[PDB]
């Protein structure tokens, strides 16, 4: 209402590509995810001429999926998942890193 | 020798061995299984989501 400094954010971005993070996207059944997964937002390219993607919610589940919930379970932070749009690990160019 | 030791090798212990089996976890196009119908072990398998 006036003010209220808090933390425990902690937006987290993963990788799309690897055994430890699957891919799910939502399913028309159920309650359009896994019983046993955490919500994902993901920035797609609907042209290949706009950049501009809608963050439709996705289902990840994983072993890291699993380390941030017992994170999450111990320390007591509510986070929020993210994906990059370029790039995987990146590289550092003139400078500049990616992923 | 060699015949006794093809006889003596047949392996194929029916490549199951219960439900803990790395056929079972991914699913195979060219092994066929399932349930019947929506009974008690489709509700188990749903409750058991993995």
Not at chain 1, 27 to 43: G, H, Y
Not at chain 1, 77 to 85: G, K, M, Q, S
Not at chain 2, 2 to 27: C, H, K, Q
């Amino acid at each position: 209402s006036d003010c209220e400094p808090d933390d425990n954010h902690l937006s987290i971005v993963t990788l799309e590509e690897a055994p430890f993070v699957i891919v799910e996207d939502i399913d028309p059944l159920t309650e359009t995810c896994v019983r046993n997964t955490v919500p994902c937002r993901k920035f797609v390219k609907i042209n290949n001429s706009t950049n501009e993607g809608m963050n439709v919610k996705k289902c990840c589940k994983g072993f890291c999926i699993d380390i941030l919930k017992k994170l999450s379970r111990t320390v007591k932070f509510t986070y929020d998942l993210y994906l990059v749009t370029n790039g995987k690990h990146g590289k550092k160019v003139n400078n500049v890193w990616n992923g | 020798a060699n015949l006794a030791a093809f006889l003596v090798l047949d392996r194929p212990e029916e490549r199951i061995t219960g439900i803990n089996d790395p056929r079972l976890r991914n699913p195979s196009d060219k092994f066929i299984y399932a349930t019947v119908k929506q009974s008690s072990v489709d509700i188990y398998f749903r409750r058991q989501v993995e």
